[PDB]
Amino acid sequence: DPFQQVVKDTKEQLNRINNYITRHNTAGDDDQEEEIQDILKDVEETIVDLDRSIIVMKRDENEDVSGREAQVKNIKQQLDALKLRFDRRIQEST
């Protein structure tokens, strides 16, 4: 299933950046700061893809809409948790 695959890719991408923030508390590498901002943007747009997939799939008599939109909610919460860590972290020095 391609949707479940993206859902998994995204959680793991999010986690990867989360782990990085935990190991490099210091808001430094302008490179990785850009790279992190690039990936997070990519994720915002990936979540629009997932949401879109659900909307056009609502007629499909198998598909588990409510079970899928619940997984997208969760991913939005995860992204939003991390955008906060990132923003908080930037206000810590240099």
Binding site: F3, D9, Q32, D49, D60
Partner: peptide, 23 residues
């Protein structure tokens, strides 16, 4: 050197996107 991007993620995104019209 340090590497954050997940492998296969662009490719999986393209599969999901290609399914979008499939009806």
């Amino acid at each position: 050197k340090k590497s954050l991007r997940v492998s296969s993620l662009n490719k999986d995104r393209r599969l999901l996107l290609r399914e979008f019209y499939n009806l």
